[PDB]
């Protein structure tokens, strides 16, 4: 698949900095970029630039506010949370985070989250200015199939 | 190239695999059937049973020259003993006719006005049993482990209704379990 | 008695029309997502329910909740403890005796009202499940108080073997319901002789509260019971309504069904909307094509930017209509009132322009100064409409200067100083100095001294009086068809059902299309309007050197960009284009020339 | 008790590890307070329990605190206070809690009340505008039989224990215990506590437009009184609680609620959307950019990111907002040390644009909208009887203006009765009033920002530049800067405007608010003979050129001419009044006058 | 910054799916964004002549410097990052006209794929030769079956053998095979099952 769901999800930004000083700039004069300078990085190049060197080039700093000031909020009540305005996806960004990181700490704690969100979703499936709908919209695709199954299954079962 | 309903069945063909099962009739009429799965008989005798496939008998009922006998568990004095073995057993469902829900809906179109007093009793004694199954199914999925389930007695219909969501939740969590190591 | 209970638990688990088994098929659907509520439907409920109501009419105030105890006992059948009690919602429709027959045969019978709700109170609490302690003897009991005869259905007795009235209300194990005392007002059209309208009071339960905003048409069905307050002659009491269910019209908070939007998308793909509305908006208006297009863009509006800094832009447009009497600027304004979601109509004499926005007064309880009234705070999200902008000089201009252009007022009267929000949209229709002389002299003499209001509004029409001998006779042919014969009421009903749009369809899709899409104009248009303005200012600049003064300043240039954003809300496209924007200036280029001649 | 006490004791062994990191903290805070009190020749009992130490490893004990918060908190106190004595008993007041953390979806905006969580933990935010009185209250008085020398003991329970609805004691003070001794009471060993109610409005931006703001109220205790100035973005957390008898205490009880909403809470916090602690890093960088000799100009251009030009106006706002000092005269009247600028301009030329975004970075300076009811600087003797026998001079609008800024509009579109009030508060820092009560001189440090419009359209050039608004010169003489905004039409000027509005329908702010609020805490030079020598020469030539030209200036204008340069050195963050500051002060007035 | 227009390119690609797949089968595909893809065809042109300068200096200037190697990677990576989107929008374009090509693959006057979206019927006229190369290929798949099996429609299973069908919006004489049914205007039928399958998908009969 050409992956139209997440090719934009790697289009999002990500703040990290350098370890060396490189004259390769495309961001606009002053072609030497000084080291340890915090730069907004798109996920695609930044994923492999933290790999290619021994010592890689980009200082991968963790955006630990996407670690510590939300691990607490999801370790309390997984019912109505801001899962969305902090990150327009919470799923593949968590996937491609853990591939470089490989730490089972938060890899346990979102595994608690999903079944709890799923526990709402099935038994929410039988049949307002800016922020609110997309709480109800990141869940949409995941169940847009599901209640459309229940919709026809009544319409055969009755007359 | 359907591209519409691919990962599961639509609800119009799940009846198509069950209509090809045989039941018993009471014939009336007297070459006849060469239909490659036939067993055509001679001048057929009434007051006797015969294992006949379903879909030809529904067509035989529109021209109205035969009659149907209900299967042996379709009395109200039989279904009650099913509701006690489950109300004492919240673990699972006990005893299942395996195609019961789609079997009744075919049986309620000129196959209901034949039987001895089933109205205001039978739809009473069925629609209760549908939800008691699905109340049981709501406690089960909360207990979801990784990659191992226990569904023992489910109708084909709920299998066509639990299906298109139960995959991609456990599949998406299969990634974060496996890609962690 | 009891056993009625057995007549209904054995009644709602099986009532159906032909093989749909509906009430179990919705209660199951209603215990899941937490609402805990019912409705009732048609006739046999009526057919034998009168045979129950012939034993419920005697007191439909205590055995109405004898329904309520039943459905909990069918609820636990669909569970297998955290189980609340339920509520009821009704339906009935034959007519509406507005406010006439209200003491004789209507104590404790089922009534239906049509009114306009005006005033909401703050919430409160009464209990429904309590726990009770005897003082020195320490008895423990629990009493439930379900339906009412306001307070004091039953009291607390003296028997625990401890002392008199030893009973106290703990707050450890208690539930609560909320009441309203919202006030109802008579719809001002049904009983005209010479009278002034009256008013009643009512309460409700929590799973039907906060469902109304002030300024709406509403209908309501409930009881007419009587309380007795001891804060006037013999022992007289007062009237009030105990409501049951508001099967209202629309809200006029964006949840609705799906087949509504299906036709809307099926209509919005046909690209004839801009021309077909101008015939179908006002079925009683001869032409007036430049003015008519200004109204549809006014009703929907643009957007609002809270862009990542401190300040903000104002996403709205505000028009004016000045001209001779007899050019239908008046009766056009009643026409926007019914079609708007929220509309008020204060169009006359300003009405004490200091008391237009805010009022404070002493209080009957605690002698306090709190905020009560306003014309703007009622009218947010929608459109107001006023007139007579010649003979108000007192406070009408000093009250709208702050109310417009930033839409952020704060009252600094004796109590609070709070910046309450406002997102309003104004409209006015004045007269010049008897019309003709302002079109037969130097083009001044419109407002008596100041033009500073005129820079604050962008769109200005200046109509006039021609004498074209073929357009009047059609008009004289027009209005006799609409006065008597009512043949165009049969004609426009004949072109309705495939080509035109009635009034009740226009209202519902405007609130849908505004509250879904969010436009933005394309950067290819940025070269277009910039090249437009520099000669527009120059066309003004060539006029000032000829000793011609007055008014154009830069609010209009940031007003055209809202105008071109307006039809993008109409087409519901997330961009804006060039055939989009060239028609937009074609409305405003036409209104630049009349600003000079 | 065994069932209701067992999970107390099992918690009594559980939470002792949940203060492994606080059992040091709770005794370190008192050992010096025990020390300094013995060598004088002070803090309350705050034990902040986080969520984290009670959610990582207890679940049954957890959700009891967020479902039934009535059988758990006096367990937590009683097991706390023994650790105070088991740690500290050798040297010769209950230590209640605060409970900070997150909550997981209990940010009930009080426009909404709850059906789910009544009698539970609630997090509430908003603004307070009531600020009622303060009044003490007894909890325990000790009696003493003066004959036979023996003592007594008595505690009074009330609607203040926050949780247990005990049998009340409808009594003030008893006499004659079971003896023939006239009872004496020791008041030094009788303990007291205070009691203060405050009403909280709604944050009037996130409540959607269908209603006026609503309100509820909260009873707090001594530990955070006088912390709540009226006009603070406060955020409280406490228990939800009903009290009062509804339906029985009077008979027939028709349409009278008897269930008052109350919050008996703890631990308020001011928020900001005064306390901004910065590290060594940012405090060093702000000195590092202080080393540049251009940063007065960069701050001017980095303020209003929408509007072209007006750099004379733009430097003035940041000069005013940061503020110039007033050195009070010892046994003498202090002078004006406030600064008070004014604007006027022909319409739609961004005169009200920059007036609303000074309120976002205001640093606790909440202004009005200039609606000129009597109350702009006064009280109007509003007391509301304050529970039958208390009369209070309720603060109208100057308790918010103190060491802050205000802004008001529409001067000529006002009556007379506000103009007499703005006379007093400008010539004098204080108002003093005796309406039906007490003469009281309460102090105020204010600084107005003005906005008016000319009368007769575009008539400024063809007539006198003066009298152009003709409001009384009592204020014009009390003001200094009358910027007259031009709107001249040039084909390169407007073309530049046209794209810049268009480019924005799609050096930082929080660093800027730190820099000024750090610069209110640095020392004030005032002292260099070199800079005072040049400015008086700079005055004298225009003292020859004020009277034969446009506008006569006065001696108080010299007190500006120190004050602008005085604040201009505050931008420099130095203690030497340089020379370079005196050149921008002269040049700013030269555009203001010519 | 770099692939920014491709982000909003694939963003509006998301709208084309949700328009079709939620409402109904009737596609009315919007437009091809030649104007949008010409912008990224301009940036890929400028980016390609950027690296051949450093391909020219890598032997003469910095002398295959480690900095220059990373400078090749950013120019390498930003190519293919752009390359990922521009075909993905290209595939989701062509993976929906096939559904138009399947359901009306020839049932009644096939090569009349006219009276159909004229503003985009010149757009997909460059894709018509792609489209008809499905249509030519779909013909031999109909004939290359060794027996006659329908591949044109009839996806819903049959239930009964007698179905009441009404007609409207149609005239003329059609159905020369399987017996002529003599279609007059607004007159219902009562027929067997297999005949009307080639006419319901044709869209002449209306209601089952
Ligand atoms: N262009 C028009 N098309 C249809 N009807 C019109 C038009 N202009 C006026 N009328 C009719 O005039 C009738 C009475 O309106 P009226 O005479 O009150 O206007 P008016 O209020 O005097 O105008 P003005 O507001 O300028 O004073 C209405 O029934 C209306 O139908
Ligand atoms: N001189 C200016 N330069 C740039 N933009 C301006 C200017 N004047 C007005 N604008 C634009 O016009 C909009 C509103 O201006 P504003 O309403 O503040 O005028 P005003 O200062 O209120 O005048 P008045 O008080 O007389 O109404 C702003 O969004 C701003 O971008």
H, E, C per residue of chain B = CCCCCCCCCCCCCCCCCCCCCEEEEEECCCCCCCCCCCCCCCCCCCCCCCEEEHHHHHHHHHCCCEEECCCCCCCHHHHHHHHHHHHCCCCCCCCCCCCHHHHHHHCCCCCCCCCCCCCCCCCHHHHHHHHHHHHHHHHHHHCCCCCCCCCCCCCHHHHHHHHHHHHHHHHHHHHHHHCCC
Residue D475 to residue D426: CA distance in whole angstroms? 8
Look at ligand 1, atom 25, and give the residue with the nearest C-alpha: C330
Angle, alpha carbons E144-E145-E151 (nearest 5°): 105
**CATH, range A1-159:** 1.20.58.2050
Which of A11, A22, A42 has its CB closest to that of E67? A22
Residue C560 to residue C541: CA distance in whole angstroms? 20
Which of A7, A8, A23 has its CB closest to that of E67? A23
Residue E88 in tokens? 């993905």
Q: Which are the contacts of A113, defined by CB distance < 8 A and separation ≥ 6?
A: A74, A78
For residue D485, give the ligand 2 atom closest to its CA: 1
Residue D176 in tokens? 């004659």
C-beta of D347 in contact with ligand 2 (< 6 A): yes
D348 labeled binding residue: yes
Residue D174 to residue D181: CA distance in whole angstroms? 13
Q: In chain C, after which residues is the C-to-N distance over 2.5 Å, breaking the chain?
A: 80, 149, 160, 231, 252, 550
- β-pairing, D482-485 vs C419-421, is unpaired
D382 has a chain C CB within 8 A of its CB? yes
Shortest distance, CA B161 to any CA of chain A (angstroms): 7
In contact, E196 and E179? CB cutoff 8 Å = no
Best mutation site among D348, D454, D497 for ligand 2, i.e. most ligand atoms within 8 A of its Cβ? D348
Dihedral angle sign, alpha carbons of residues C8, C10, C13, C17: negative
In contact, C160 and C134? CB cutoff 8 Å = yes
**What is the end-to-end Cα distance of chain E in Å, rounded?**
56
Nearest CA in chain D to C148: D254
Verify whether the Cβ–Cβ distance D494 to C169 is below 8 Å. no
What's the domain range around C400?
258-596
Nearest CA in chain C to E15: C574
In contact, B25 and B31? CB cutoff 8 Å = no
Residue D61 in tokens? 């004990």
User: How many contacts (CB atoms, under 8 Å) link A and C?
Assistant: 14
Instruction: Give how many domains chain B has, as a whole number.
Output: 1
Q: Which helix (H) or strand (E) holds D31?
A: helix D25-36
The DSSP secondary-structure symbol of C87 reads B
Q: How many CB atoms lie within 10 A of CB D150?
A: 12
Residues from chain B contacting residue A96 (CB–CB below 8 Å): none
For residue D349, give the ligand 2 atom closest to its CA: 8
Secondary structure class of C571 (helix, strand, coil): helix
Residue E208 to residue E204: CA distance in whole angstroms? 12
Q: Which helix (H) or strand (E) holds D243?
A: strand D233-243
Nearest ligand to residue C285 Cα = 1
Q: What are phi and psi of D128, to 5 degrees?
A: -110, 140
D486 has a chain C CB within 8 A of its CB? no
Residue C24 in tokens? 């179990």
Secondary structure class of D562 (helix, strand, coil): helix
Task: Pick the closest to residue B74 from B12, B13, B23, B18 (CA basis).
Answer: B23
How far, in Å, are A124, A134, C311, D255 from residue C306 at the CA level? 34, 19, 7, 45
In D102-156, alpha helices (H):
none
Which of C21, C28, C80 has its CB closest to that of B123? C21
**Tokens 């199914």 appear where?**
B137
Name the packing angle between helices C331-339 and C289-300 (round to 10°): 30
How far, in Å, are A34, D148, D567, E65 from residue A31 at the CA level? 9, 95, 40, 16
D46: left (phi over 0), alpha (psi -120 to 50) or beta: beta
How far, in Å, are C552, D205, D307 from residue C456 at the CA level? 10, 25, 19
DSSP-assigned states of every residue in C399-460: HHHHHTTT-EEE--SSS---EEE-----EEE---SSSSGGGSS-S--SSSS--TTTTT--EE
Residue B93 to residue B82: CA distance in whole angstroms? 9
D346 labeled binding residue: yes
Burial of D379 (0-12, 13-18, 19+ CB in 10 A): buried
Domain ranges of chain E: 1-154, 155-208
Resolution, angstroms, 1 dp: 5.8
Q: How many CB atoms lie within 10 A of CB A142?
A: 17
Residue A3 to residue D401: CA distance in whole angstroms? 58
Chains near B, with 3+ CB pairs < 8 A?
A, C, E
Nearest ligand to residue C288 Cα = 1
C-beta of D352 in contact with ligand 2 (< 6 A): yes
Residue D341 in tokens? 């600028």
In contact, B40 and B60? CB cutoff 8 Å = no
Q: Show which residues on chain B lie within 8 Å of chain A, measured between beta carbons.
A: 8, 10-12, 105, 138, 141-142, 144, 157, 160-161, 163-165, 168-169, 172-173, 175-177, 179-181
Chains near E, with 3+ CB pairs < 8 A?
A, B, C
How far, in Å, are B157, D324, D343, D567, D573 from residue D290 at the CA level? 75, 19, 31, 15, 8
Angle, alpha carbons C445-C451-C456 (nearest 5°): 140
Verify whether the Cβ–Cβ distance A26 to E14 is below 8 Å. no
Residue C299 to residue C567: CA distance in whole angstroms? 11
Residue C410 to residue C430: CA distance in whole angstroms? 28
For residue C326, give the ligand 1 atom closest to its CA: 23
Nearest CA in chain A to E79: A45
Secondary structure class of D142 (helix, strand, coil): strand
In contact, C36 and C78? CB cutoff 8 Å = no
Task: Pick the closest to residue D32 from D41, D40, D23, D21 (CA basis).
Answer: D40
């Amino acid at each position: 698949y050409y992956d139209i769901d997440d090719v934009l999800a790697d289009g999002t930004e990500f703040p990290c900095k350098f370890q060396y000083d490189i004259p390769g700039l495309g961001y606009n004069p002053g072609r030497p970029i000084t080291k340890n300078t915090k730069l907004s990085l798109p996920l695609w190049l930044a994923r492999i630039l933290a790999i290619v060197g021994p010592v890689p080039f980009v200082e991968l700093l963790p955006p630990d506010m996407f670690s510590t000031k939300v691990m607490n909020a999801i370790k309390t009540d997984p019912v109505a949370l801001d899962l969305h305005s902090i990150n327009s996806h919470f799923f593949s960004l968590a996937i491609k985070w853990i591939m470089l990181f490989s730490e089972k700490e938060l890899a346990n704690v979102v595994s608690e989250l999903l079944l709890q969100r799923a526990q709402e979703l099935n038994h929410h499936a039988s049949s307002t200015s800016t922020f609110l709908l997309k709480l109800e919209e990141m869940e949409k695709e995941i169940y847009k199939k599901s209640h459309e199954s229940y919709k026809d299954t009544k319409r055969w079962m009755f007359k | 190239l359907p591209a519409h309903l691919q990962q599961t069945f639509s609800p119009e063909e799940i009846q198509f695999i069950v209509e090809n099962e045989p039941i018993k009739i009471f014939p009336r009429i007297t070459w006849q059937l060469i239909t490659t799965d036939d067993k055509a008989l001679n001048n057929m005798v009434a007051m006797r049973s015969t294992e006949v496939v379903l879909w030809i008998a529904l067509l035989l009922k529109q021209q109205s020259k035969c009659s149907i006998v209900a299967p042996q568990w379709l009395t109200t004095k039989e279904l009650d003993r099913k509701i006690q073995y489950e109300k004492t057993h919240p673990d699972r469902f006990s005893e299942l006719p395996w195609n019961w829900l789609v079997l009744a809906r075919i049986l309620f179109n000129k196959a209901k006005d034949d039987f001895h007093d089933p109205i205001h009793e039978l739809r009473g004694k069925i629609q209760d049993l549908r939800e008691i199954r699905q109340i049981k199914v709501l406690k089960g999925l909360k207990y979801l482990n990784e990659s191992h389930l226990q569904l023992d007695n489910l109708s084909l219909l709920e299998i066509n209704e639990l299906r298109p969501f139960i995959t991609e939740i456990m599949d998406k969590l299969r990634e974060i379990h496996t890609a962690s190591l | 008695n009891t056993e009625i209970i057995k007549s209904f638990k054995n009644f709602i688990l099986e009532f159906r029309l032909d093989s749909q088994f509906i009430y179990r098929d919705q209660l199951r659907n209603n215990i899941l997502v937490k609402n805990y509520s019912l409705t009732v439907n048609m006739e046999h409920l009526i057919g034998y329910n009168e045979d129950i109501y012939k034993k419920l009419s005697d007191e439909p105030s205590d055995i109405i909740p004898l329904f309520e105890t039943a459905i909990t006992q069918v609820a636990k059948r669909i569970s297998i403890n955290s189980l609340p009690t339920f509520q009821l919602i009704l339906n009935s429709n034959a007519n509406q005796i507005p406010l006439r027959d209200l003491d004789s045969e209507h104590v404790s019978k089922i009534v239906r009202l049509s009114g306009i709700i005006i005033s909401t109170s703050v919430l409160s609490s009464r209990a429904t499940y309590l726990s009770i302690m005897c003082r020195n003897c320490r008895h423990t009991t629990s009493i439930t108080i379900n339906n009412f005869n306001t307070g004091n259905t039953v009291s607390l007795p003296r028997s625990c073997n401890c002392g008199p009235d030893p009973y106290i209300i703990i707050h450890e194990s208690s539930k609560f319901i909320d009441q309203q005392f919202l006030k109802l007002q008579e719809i001002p059209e049904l009983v005209p002789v010479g009278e002034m309208p009256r008013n009643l009071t009512m309460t409700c339960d929590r799973y039907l509260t906060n469902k109304v905003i002030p300024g709406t048409r509403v209908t309501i069905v409930g009881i007419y019971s009587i309380y007795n307050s001891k804060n006037s002659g013999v022992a007289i009491r007062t009237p009030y309504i105990k409501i049951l269910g508001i099967q209202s019209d629309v809200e006029t908070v964006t949840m609705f069904t799906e087949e509504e939007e299906e036709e809307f998308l099926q209509l919005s793909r046909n690209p004839k909307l801009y021309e077909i509305l101008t015939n179908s908006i006002a079925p009683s208006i001869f032409g007036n094509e430049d003015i008519k297009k200004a109204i549809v863009c006014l009703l929907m509006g643009g957007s609002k930017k809270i862009l990542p800094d401190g300040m903000r832009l104002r996403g709205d447009i505000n028009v004016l209509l000045l001209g001779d009497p007899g050019t239908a600027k008046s009766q056009l304004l009643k026409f926007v009132e019914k079609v708007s979601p929220i509309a008020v109509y204060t169009s006359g004499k300003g009405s004490s322009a200091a008391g237009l926005t805010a009022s404070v007064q002493r209080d009957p309880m605690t002698r306090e100064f709190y905020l009560e009234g306003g014309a703007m705070v009622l009218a947010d999200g929608g459109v107001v409409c006023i007139d007579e902008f010649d003979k108000m000089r007192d406070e009408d201009r000093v009250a709208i200067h702050e109310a417009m252009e930033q839409q952020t007022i704060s009252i600094a009267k004796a109590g609070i100083t709070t910046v309450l929000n406002s997102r309003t949209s104004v409209l006015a229709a004045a007269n010049p100095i008897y019309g003709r002389y302002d079109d037969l002299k130097s083009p001044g003499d419109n407002i008596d001294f100041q033009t500073t209001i005129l820079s604050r509004f962008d769109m200005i029409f200046i109509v006039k009086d021609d004498h074209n001998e073929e357009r009047d006779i059609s008009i004289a042919n027009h209005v006799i068809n609409i006065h008597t014969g009512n043949a165009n009421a049969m004609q426009n009903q004949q072109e309705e059902n495939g080509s035109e749009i009635s009034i009740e369809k226009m209202k519902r899709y405007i609130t849908y299309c505004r509250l879904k899409c969010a436009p933005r104009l394309s950067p290819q248009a940025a070269e277009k309007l910039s090249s437009n303005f520099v000669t527009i200012r120059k066309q003004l600049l060539i006029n000032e050197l000829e000793s011609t003064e007055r008014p154009i300043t830069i609010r209009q240039l940031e007003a055209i960009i809202r105008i071109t954003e307006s039809l993008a809300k109409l087409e519901l496209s997330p961009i804006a284009q060039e055939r989009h924007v060239d028609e937009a200036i074609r409305l405003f280029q036409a209104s630049t020339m009349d600003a000079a001649s | 008790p065994d069932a209701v006490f067992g999970d107390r004791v099992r918690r009594f062994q559980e939470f002792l590890d949940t203060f492994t990191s606080y059992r040091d903290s709770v005794r370190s805070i008192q050992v010096y307070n025990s020390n300094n009190a013995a060598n004088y020749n002070i803090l309350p009992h705050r034990i902040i329990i986080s969520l984290d130490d009670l959610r990582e490893f207890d679940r049954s004990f957890w959700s009891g605190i967020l479902v039934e918060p009535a059988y758990f908190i006096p367990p937590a106190e009683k097991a706390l206070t023994d650790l105070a004595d088991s740690m500290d008993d050798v040297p010769h007041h209950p230590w209640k809690l605060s409970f900070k953390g997150s909550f997981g979806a209990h940010a009930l905006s009080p426009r909404t009340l709850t059906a789910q969580h009544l009698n539970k933990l609630v997090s509430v935010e908003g603004i307070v505008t009531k600020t009622s009185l303060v009044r003490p209250k007894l909890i325990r008085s000790v009696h003493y039989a003066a004959k036979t020398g023996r003592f007594h003991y008595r505690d009074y329970t009330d609607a203040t224990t926050t949780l247990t609805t005990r049998i009340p004691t409808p009594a003030i003070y008893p006499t004659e215990d079971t003896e023939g001794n006239k009872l004496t009471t020791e008041y030094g060993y009788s303990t007291f506590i205070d009691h203060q109610r405050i009403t909280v409005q709604e944050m009037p931006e996130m409540a959607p437009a269908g209603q006026l703001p609503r309100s509820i109220d909260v009873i707090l205790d001594d530990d955070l009184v006088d912390k709540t100035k009226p006009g603070d973005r406060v955020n409280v957390v406490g228990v939800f609680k009903s009290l009062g008898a509804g339906g029985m205490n009077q008979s027939n009880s028709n349409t009278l609620i008897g269930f008052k909403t109350l919050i008996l809470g703890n631990t308020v916090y001011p928020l900001h959307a005064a306390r901004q602690m910065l590290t060594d890093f940012d405090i060093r960088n702000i000195n590092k950019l202080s080393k540049k000799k251009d940063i007065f100009d960069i701050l001017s251009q980095s303020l209003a990111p929408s509007i072209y030009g007006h750099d004379h106006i733009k430097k003035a706002i940041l000069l005013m907002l940061m503020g110039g000092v007033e050195k009070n005269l010892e046994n003498g009247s202090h002078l004006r040390g406030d600064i008070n600028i004014l604007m006027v301009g022909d319409p739609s030329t961004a005169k009200s644009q920059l007036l609303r975004f000074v309120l976002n970075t205001a640093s606790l300076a909440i202004a009005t909208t200039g609606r000129g009811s009597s109350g702009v600087g006064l009280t109007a003797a509003v007391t509301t009887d304050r529970e039958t026998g208390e009369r209070r001079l309720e603060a109208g609008a100057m308790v918010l203006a103190d060491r802050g800024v205000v802004c008001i509009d529409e001067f000529d579109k006002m009556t007379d009765v506000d103009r007499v009030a703005i006379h007093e508060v400008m010539e004098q820092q204080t108002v003093t009033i005796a309406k039906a009560g007490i003469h009281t001189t309460l102090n105020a440090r204010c600084s107005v920002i003005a906005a008016a419009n000319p009368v007769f359209g575009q008539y400024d050039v063809n007539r006198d530049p003066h009298q152009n608004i003709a409001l009384p010169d009592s204020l014009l003489s009390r003001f200094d800067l009358l910027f007259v905004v031009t709107d001249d039409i040039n084909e390169i000027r407007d073309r530049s405007i046209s794209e810049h509005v268009l480019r924005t329908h799609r050096v930082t702010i929080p660093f800027l608010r730190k820099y000024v609020q750090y610069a209110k805490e640095r020392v004030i030079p005032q002292l260099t003979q070199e800079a005072i020598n040049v400015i008086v020469k700079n005055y004298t030539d225009l003292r020859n050129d004020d009277n034969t030209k446009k506008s006569p200036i006065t001696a108080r204008t010299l007190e500006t001419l120190i004050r602008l340069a005085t604040a201009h050195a505050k931008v420099r963050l130095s203690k030497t009044v340089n020379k370079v500051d005196a050149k921008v002060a002269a040049n700013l007035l030269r555009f203001a006058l010519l | 910054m770099y692939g920014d227009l491709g982000n909003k390119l694939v963003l509006e690609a998301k709208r084309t799916k949700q328009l079709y797949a939620r409402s109904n089968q009737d596609v009315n595909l919007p437009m091809y964004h030649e104007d949008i893809i010409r912008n990224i065809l301009k940036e890929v042109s400028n980016l390609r002549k950027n690296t051949e300068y450093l391909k020219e200096q890598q032997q003469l200037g910095m002398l295959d410097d480690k900095v220059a190697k990373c400078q090749y990677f950013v120019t390498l990576l930003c190519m293919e990052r752009n390359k990922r989107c521009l075909l993905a929008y290209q595939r989701l374009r062509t993976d929906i006209l096939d559904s138009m090509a399947w359901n009306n693959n020839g049932l009644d006057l096939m090569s009349s794929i006219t009276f159909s979206q004229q503003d985009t019927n010149n757009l997909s006229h460059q894709e018509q030769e792609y489209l008809k190369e499905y249509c030519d290929l779909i013909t031999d798949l109909k004939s290359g079956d060794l027996v006659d099996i329908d591949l044109s429609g009839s996806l819903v299973p049959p239930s009964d053998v007698f179905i009441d069908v009404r007609v409207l919006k149609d005239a003329g004489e059609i159905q020369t095979e399987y017996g002529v049914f003599n279609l007059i205007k607004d007159s219902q039928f009562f027929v067997r099952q297999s005949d009307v399958e080639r006419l319901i998908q044709q869209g002449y009969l209306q209601k089952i």
